[PDB]
Every structure is written in C-alpha cells, then in structure tokens.
Design a protein around this ligand. Structure first.
Ligand SMILES: OC[C@H]1O[C@H](O)[C@@H](O)[C@@H](O)[C@@H]1O
Ligand SMILES: OC[C@H]1O[C@H](O)[C@@H](O)[C@@H](O)[C@@H]1O
Ligand SMILES: OC[C@H]1O[C@H](O)[C@@H](O)[C@@H](O)[C@@H]1O
Ligand SMILES: OC[C@H]1O[C@H](O)[C@@H](O)[C@@H](O)[C@@H]1O
Ligand SMILES: OC[C@H]1O[C@H](O)[C@@H](O)[C@@H](O)[C@@H]1O
Ligand SMILES: OC[C@H]1O[C@H](O)[C@@H](O)[C@@H](O)[C@@H]1O
Ligand SMILES: OC[C@H]1O[C@H](O)[C@@H](O)[C@@H](O)[C@@H]1O
Ligand SMILES: OC[C@H]1O[C@H](O)[C@@H](O)[C@@H](O)[C@@H]1O
Lengths: 144, 144, 144, 144
C-alpha cells in the first residue's frame, strides 16, 4: 500500500467502504450534499490508468464535481461531524482546498470541526462509512 | 524525507522549529503545560541511534513525561487551539492516544478542536512554532 | 523525496545528471545506443503534469523509443558495464522488462552484468553520469 | 508494507520464505556459508521491539554474525548466483557493505554477479527461497 491512512472522522453506523488499489494521483471528486454529505465518488490514477472509486452513499442532495487541473493538488481538507435527525454522528460538511482554489464548504457546518492541513504530501484517495449518507470519512496520503 | 507532514494547527507567531533528521520511531515526549501547552521535547530513533529534538518553548507550566514501551505507538492525537492572554491563537491542549493507554489532556481542552486518528501509519516526530509557549503544532507520519 | 534510489552502476567519469522533481509515473524512455549506451531521455508525471528529463549523453548510435501503455510498468531492469575505447568503465547495455513485453537489449550485452528485479514497487525515474556516452546509471523506485 | 521489494536473485527451487511484519531497522544478520550460502537469519526492529526472522535454510557450512552498531547501516549488497552440484542455480556468495566496513564475501564467488548499491534508502529485511541451501535471495528497502 505504502500510504498513510487517516481516519475515521464521524460515527460508527453505515457500512465500511474502501479502495482496492494503489492510487498515486487524485483526479476527480464527485460529492453529493445538502444538509449533510450524502455520497462520495472519486477517480484516481494507477500505473497511468484511471479507476473510479464509489459511488459510496445514497442518492440524496445535489451533486458537485471537482476536476483537478494538471499541477493542481489538495493542500488541506476541513469538515465537521455531528448529529442529523436520527443519525447520532455523521459527516455534516467538507471543504477541499487545493493549491489553486477552495471547493466548498459542501453540506452544512454543524458539529465538531476537524482539519487536515498538509505541509508535505499528496492526498490520493478516500475511504469511509456509508449508508444513505456519509457516516464517516478518511483520507489516503502519499509522501511527496 | 519520505514522511507525510501534517500541520500547522495554531497561530502564526513565535518561531518555526523543526527536525533535521530521518526519524523512524518516536520513543519519548516531554510536554510542559498548564492553561496551554508551554513546550515540547521528544526523542526519536534514526539508524539505531537516539536523538533528542527540542526543547521547543518556554519553562512555564508543569512537566509530564511519556515514555513509550516496546510495542507501544501512537494511534491518534487530539488538541485544541485558541487565544491565551495577549496571544491571538496558540495550542491550548494536546492528548496523545497510544494502542495501550491515553496520555493527557495536557493544557485545557477548550477552544477549537482538531484530531488526527491514524488508521494505518506511525507518528515518528513533530514540529511547530514556539516562543514562550507553543504557538503551533504539526506531526510527521510514516507509512506502516 | 520518498523514493528509494539505487546506483550507480558503471564508472566515475562524465558528469552527474539527476532529476529535480517528485516523479510518480514513468511514461516514456528514449535511448540512444550501438556498441554501448549513448544517451538517455525519459518522461515522468508529477501532479498530473508531464515533465521531460534529459537528454543526457551524446548523439551517437541509433534511437529507440519505449512508450508505456496505461497499465504497463517496469518489473525488472538488466544491464552490463565495462570498457569501451578509451573509457575505463561505462554502461554497455540495458534491457527494460515490463509486465507486458521486453524492450532491448540496447547496446551489447557483454561485460559485467547487473540486474534489478522488482518484486514490489514501481520504477519512476533514472539518473546517472554522462559525457558523450552513459558513464553510469541509476534508478528511482517508489513503494507500491 | 510500504517497502520496495527487490528480487529474486537465484533459482526456482526450495521453498519461498518471507517476513510477516513491518521492519524499520536491520540490527543483525546470522549467515551460514561454505561453498555456497547455506542459511540466513536476521533481526529487525518494529515499533521498538526486536523480532527474529528465520532461520531460513539448512544447517550446513559455518556461521558468521554481523551485529550493526548504532549509526551503522548497509549501503550495498553484492553476490553471485550459479550452479552447485545438482542445484541448477542458487546463491553462491554474498557481501554486505555498510557505511563503516565490509562483511564478506561469504561462500564462494562463482556464477553470474549481481550488485545493489544504495544511493538513498535503508535495507531493513530480506526474503528468499530456501531448502538445504539458499536457492534465492531478495531485499526489502525503506525510503530514507
Ligand atoms: O443532506 C441530507 C439530506 O438533505 C436534504 O433533506 C435532502 O436534499 C436529502 O436528499 C439529503 O439526503
Ligand atoms: O447513512 C446514514 C444511515 O444510512 C442508513 O439508514 C443506514 O445504513 C444507517 O446505518 C446509516 O446511519
Ligand atoms: O500554560 C500557560 C500558562 O498558564 C498559566 O498562566 C500559568 O499556570 C503558567 O504557568 C503557564 O505558563
Ligand atoms: O509563544 C507565545 C509568544 O512568545 C513570545 O512572546 C514571542 O515569540 C511571540 O511571538 C509568541 O506569540
Ligand atoms: O555506442 C557507442 C558507439 O559505438 C560505436 O563505436 C559506433 O556505432 C557509435 O555510433 C557509438 O557512439
Ligand atoms: O561519456 C564518455 C566520456 O565523455 C566525455 O569525453 C567526457 O565527459 C568523459 O569524462 C567521459 O568518460
Ligand atoms: O556451502 C555448501 C556446503 O559446503 C560444504 O560442502 C559443507 O560445509 C556443507 O555443510 C555446506 O552445505
Ligand atoms: O537448497 C537446495 C535444495 O535443498 C533441498 O534439497 C530441496 O528443497 C531443493 O528444492 C533445493 O534446491
């Protein structure tokens, strides 16, 4: 693997979903959100071929697409976790900050904050726990 | 060099302090704290030799020592940042969770939280910004 | 920076040439050769952008181009070192073996052999020593 | 794992033997040898605890022990593979070069040479194929 794997942020419900590969570049994120984060889908590169992970989560909210340009990469992720309805603890919001611009916040910023500023490294993939929504979230990082 | 470097959590004052080496094992932390985190000092192993980083920060508060046992390693770090006195934003508290027990809280766990749960990897060193207190804090992780 | 760097195979003359980047994928090699290896040039990907390293070496011999397909990567490299003309020790031949086919031999496979079979990892870049020919050769590998 | 794994050098007989761990430091090698390399055993450090790998191979030849000092690490390995008796291809000799001294050659230098000079990295463990002798040999390297 040889990735640093951070997580999980969020609760214990839903079902664990994870990659089966060796990503070296994150190229695309499709995120569904509204009052919380509904679903995650992302594309990564491995040995020059592009693979799609997800979609993980439900079909609620509205969709937003992040297509990273060549030379663009994530330098930080922020979010919040907390209650919604009957769910004790899930991912309420996510913000993706690249070296060129900020994407988000997606969802609504309620609950306990978290933040992952990256001084040296590359974010290449994600994992989490998912049901009809994103119960929990985690990150794969590669040394730079 | 092949480490993922996360940070900084906290403010922009004090002075940057950082390691000059290639750590593969964190063996000891000495932390001074009271209402905030006053100072950090830690030992790491490189090529079988033990090196001391720090002390970074002042001589206020009280001292606590964490000596990791063989087979003991950090699985998560928590903290809070915020104002103290005349300082706009510094590290108010830190908690270190190993696979055997929890160390802390050091400081006071009020203010804005951050958290770094490690699903796969090893925390091997730290860096930050320091004056008479710990202005900012960061972490080095190795893939596992 | 988080790469394993193997080398050098060959002699001590010519001039050191090396990359200035963080490669994650080798996409192309252009090699000039005849009785020895005359020059090396290769393309790699970093943050989704393609960068060209080299050409290192002279304009003798004949050119061959290796363009790796998506999903194609090197699993082994072979070569030989030895004398040519007035040069005490240089790279006489190189063979590049991918998971799909074998490229070469380039040069002449006489002299002292070396071999780098990769059980787990990825070859992402090269370096060496160069004058009018390839005096010496080395390899960058990434954990897989 | 997050190690670069090189190999195998040697033949296809014997039985594959390999580590079940995440070594970060090689501390000791015990090698049995005579006309070829008979067996390998080595100690490594993981999360500050010492683990013994092997012994792999038979009980022939004579034993030699390499105990690395703090601050001592391997910078290169050399060897030869080839026939002995009824064995078509096995490991005939090995030499271990540290930043302080050279250990070996062990065995007898017959057959096809190989060499692994390390410009950047650390050798932390080995694997191979083994019967009554060392049929084949491989190396684990960590980025530095
Ligand atoms: O964000 C959670 C939830 O928010 C809103 O109620 C709707 O858009 C749903 O489709 C969505 O699942
Ligand atoms: O995603 C929110 C919610 O989705 C579904 O209802 C179930 O899988 C729950 O376990 C989960 O908490
Ligand atoms: O921790 C910051 C600061 O907190 C309080 O003001 C006192 O207890 C000091 O000893 C300490 O330096
Ligand atoms: O550490 C708290 C404080 O210490 C010193 O007074 C200076 O370095 C300041 O810049 C810093 O904010
Ligand atoms: O390859 C080294 C050298 O080999 C021969 O001398 C010739 O074919 C040259 O074209 C070439 O430069
Ligand atoms: O490359 C072969 C030869 O090329 C040039 O003449 C010089 O750089 C030499 O040092 C080198 O040995
Ligand atoms: O080295 C292979 C072989 O060499 C010699 O014949 C003896 O020392 C044996 O014990 C050993 O197995
Ligand atoms: O190690 C040399 C030899 O040992 C044993 O005889 C068997 O396991 C063989 O397969 C192997 O080739």
């Amino acid at each position: 693997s040889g990735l640093v794997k951070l997580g999980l942020w969020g609760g214990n419900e839903g079902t664990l979903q994870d990659i089966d590969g060796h990503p070296t570049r994150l190229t695309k994120i499709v995120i569904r959100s509204a009052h919380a984060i509904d679903a995650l889908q992302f594309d990564y590169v491995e040995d020059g071929k592009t693979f799609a992970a997800g979609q993980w989560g439900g079909n609620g909210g509205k969709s937003d697409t992040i297509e990273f340009q060549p030379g663009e990469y994530l330098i930080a992720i922020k979010g919040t976790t907390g209650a919604l309805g009957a769910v004790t603890n899930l991912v309420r919001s996510l913000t993706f900050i690249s070296n060129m611009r900020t994407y988000g916040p997606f969802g609504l910023e309620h609950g306990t904050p978290f933040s992952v500023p990256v001084a040296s490294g590359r974010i290449v993939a994600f994992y989490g726990r998912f049901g009809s929504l994103v119960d929990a979230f985690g990150i794969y990082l590669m040394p730079y």
